[PDB]
Specification:
The structure is cut from a larger assembly and holds four copies of chain A. Chain A is mainly beta and 447 residues long. Chain A is built from four helices and 24 strands. Chain A has helices at residues 210-214, 361-368, 371-375, 440-446, and strands at 12-16, 23-24, 30-31, 36-38, 48-52, 72-83, 90-91, 94-99, 120-124, 130-135, 140-146, 163-169, 175-176, 204-207, 231-236, 267-271, 286-287, 303-310, 313-314, 320-322, 334-336, 340-341, 346-356, 421-424. Chain A is globular. The PDB classes it as virus like particle.
């Protein structure tokens, strides 16, 4: 809906970064007693990338024989995109040293009663994933959470609490589904031992599009892709007391040792599959000439969110380190740490668009978000009560010494609690893309 | 939009319900249809807690009865306004 | 002016409503009632709701542009009815 | 062959439906069921209703004559919204 407001220039540019600070352990955090030394870095997380842009009206434009400042304004418009995917192509399989298990229910024969702590050292792989998120508004993630109950019966231990959808903005490091639903995995799975470690102490979420497609803003939707594949390997169980038992009406009772109730809880073993070179969407430029959203690349706030999830580059590398070699060969000789390295890079082609200024033009931007006009220079509001006193703190302290109490009220970011990766990329522009690979093929397209 | 303030100041309780889709003359919409919750199982988490409620005297009792969707475009088969058709002409 | 006037007129409505109640007092069991206190010396106030007039109207309406035409019903007349013995 | 089509179309859609329960059987208490037998292995019968076309407003449509003509909605676009993480 934006293109009816704004006209078009014929001016283009490019920026791109180097790489990323992305190495570390997959499952948890290395800390000393004070702070985290080595961050928990795996490939199975949502990967939120924030970038900032320089404003073109604030930028020194050498061409001013075309359009005037007080007549029209300028905002960059998004056309091209690329991601840096150049790791080795691999897959890690992980699990839990203590996973609750009866036996294999896939084959025949085995069934008993459990005693003490049958949780054992299992490790199972995951599903495929390939996606890409872009927007000047962040995406909102979706998962579930336990529901509160109306007070007509008091809650005992071992009850059936209901469920409730929790919608929240994703951070970098949030956990994608591996075929086990999306909920409070740290709280609801009360054993902390029924899932693998990497999804134990966290929550897991899944991104829905249709609710974002339901909102006609399109500030958090430009263009996305989806390539996810899965199938099942085995059939297994869990070790514990069955909470809700089988109604004996719809079954038939047996005798002897077969009187007892075995597992009613049965656990899927999710599995990956063959991966290809061809099924990857990546290293491939796309053109947002017209998209499924109202925003035609006009990423507001000089700001842009980027999120991509892929696990095709996802193997851990083992490592050993000698403490001693006193005998010929023993097993107390080496320490084994788990580290995982990943890379990303970000490549874009932007256009510039000249937007005029009118009262009806300023109407929709005033109500879509206030921060852009708060950033914009159109506030009058005549210059108020600067007539008052500005005065010296001094010393020999009259009694108010140290009067540097109010520098604040600047803070335009409510997302300080939100922790995700950042890119400063203002300083990297150039006019002609011919010294750069990625928009060159657009210049191969155009002529 | 000049008399749209006259209906705004008729009562602010009007245009909070009579939105309709067009506000004071920015003229935008809310568009928050993600919040539509459904269920079948008895979760008891119905919207009966407090939020911003038009006509806040719903805590006070009354007798309101629905009559909306019953309408007729043909009226002379009803005895009432045909008397008014005899009245008005 | 600010309003104008159309050409077409309407009505339909439902018929009847039973109201039963004790004349003196109300009856409630220890946490519920079966029948309320309905009595002749009460403020019988009755309230109606009406369909939306703008988008929801006669289909033989050709007048309006969507951009600025808001459409409302207009009240003309009513009739109440009291069909009991008078006592 | 027999009907002429209306020049002007519409949109409606729902916004959500949820269904949560237990796969293998229904959770039945001594009175009734509070949680029924719900899984993805079940057939999914859905009926939609739709309004009679006489209570709606149109931009320019006084030409058809209700003493001699008839209108009805018609299905043209269809879309099924599924957005659960797969498995």
């Amino acid at each position: 809906a934006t293109d009816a407001y704004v006209t078009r220039t014929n001016i283009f540019y490019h920026a791109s970064s180097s790489r990323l600070l992305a190495v570390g352990h997959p499952y948890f955090s290395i800390k000393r007693a004070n702070k985290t030394v080595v961050p928990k870095v795996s490939g199975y997380q949502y990967r939120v990338f924030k970038v900032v842009l320089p404003d073109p009206n604030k930028f020194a434009l050498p061409d001013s024989s075309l359009f005037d400042p007080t007549t029209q304004r300028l905002v960059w418009a998004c056309t091209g995109l690329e991601v840096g995917r150049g790791q080795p192509l691999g897959v890690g399989v992980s699990g839990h040293p203590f996973l609750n298990k009866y036996d294999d229910v896939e084959n025949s024969g085995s069934g008993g009663n459990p005693g003490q702590d049958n949780r054992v050292n299992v490790g199972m792989d995951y599903k495929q994933t390939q996606l890409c998120m872009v927007g000047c508004a962040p995406p909102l993630g979706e998962h579930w959470g336990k529901g509160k109950q109306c007070t007509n019966t008091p809650v005992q231990a071992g009850d059936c609490p209901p469920l409730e959808l929790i919608t929240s903005v994703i951070q970098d490091g949030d956990m994608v589904d591996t075929g086990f639903g999306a909920m409070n995995f740290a709280d609801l799975q009360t054993n902390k031992s029924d899932v693998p470690i990497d999804i134990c102490g966290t929550t897991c979420k899944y991104p829905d599009y249709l609710q974002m497609a339901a909102d006609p803003y399109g500030d958090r939707l430009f263009f996305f892709l989806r390539k996810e594949q899965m199938f099942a390997r085995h059939f297994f169980n869990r070790a514990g007391e069955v909470g809700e038992p089988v109604p004996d009406t719809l079954i038939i009772k047996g005798s002897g040792n077969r009187t007892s109730v075995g597992s009613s809880i049965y656990v899927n073993t999710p599995s990956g599959s063959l991966v290809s070179s061809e099924a990857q969407l990546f290293n491939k430029p796309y053109w947002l000439q017209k998209a499924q959203g109202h925003n035609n690349g006009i990423c507001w706030g000089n700001q842009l969110f980027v999120t991509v999830v892929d696990t095709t580059r996802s193997t851990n590398m083992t490592l050993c380190a000698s403490v001693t070699t006193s005998s010929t060969y023993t097993n107390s000789d080496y320490k084994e740490y788990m580290r995982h390295v990943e890379e990303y890079d970000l490549q874009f082609i932007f256009q510039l668009c000249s937007i005029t200024l009118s009262a009806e033009v300023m109407a929709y931007i005033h109500t879509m978000n206030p921060s852009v006009l708060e950033d914009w220079n159109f506030g009058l509001s005549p210059p108020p009560n600067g007539t008052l006193e500005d005065t010296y703190r001094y010393v020999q302290s009259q009694a108010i010494t140290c009067q540097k109490p109010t520098p604040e009220k600047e803070k335009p970011d409510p997302y300080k609690n939100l922790s995700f990766w950042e890119v400063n990329l203002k300083e990297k522009f150039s006019s002609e893309l011919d010294q750069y690979p990625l928009g060159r093929k657009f210049l191969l397209q155009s002529g």
